[PDB]
Design a protein around this ligand. Sequence first.
Ligand code: 1GH
Length: 127
Amino acid sequence: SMNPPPPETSNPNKPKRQTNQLQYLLRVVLKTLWKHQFAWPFQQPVDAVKLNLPDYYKIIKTPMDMGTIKKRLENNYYWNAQECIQDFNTMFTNCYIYNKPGDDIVLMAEALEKLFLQKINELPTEE
Ligand SMILES: COc1cc2c(cc1-c1c(C)noc1C)ncc1[nH]c(=O)n([C@H](C)c3ccccn3)c12
């Protein structure tokens, strides 16, 4: 089984803007999650070939990872902070769907999600 192409991280036809919330998502939320000791499996797309998971992309149809989210933020791909937050949620949800409760990767995702939610709770009001 082949890996799909990674999610799109740039599109020159999409409009671009800077907002304080998007800045916070990059400078605070992503920065904090990236350095967490359990972040490493979430820092790039799931390579189902190398991990030998032939059913991964049969089960997960909307893949997402923090490497892709990082690239989207740096490319000004997101217009709304909500789009970025949705991508984080998709990343966590995908992990919980593919894997089983109590699995190592699930416990790792749960730790990251807790931290994510703590940082999103301090998302500044739109300027
Ligand atoms: C056991 O799950 C993974 C293990 C990964 C991974 C992605 C996943 C993963 C994620 C994330 N969501 O579904 C899967 C499957 N990406 C890279 C990577 N490098 C790497 O060595 N792993 C192993 C197998 C690992 C790490 C942590 C916990 C359990 N197993 C992994």
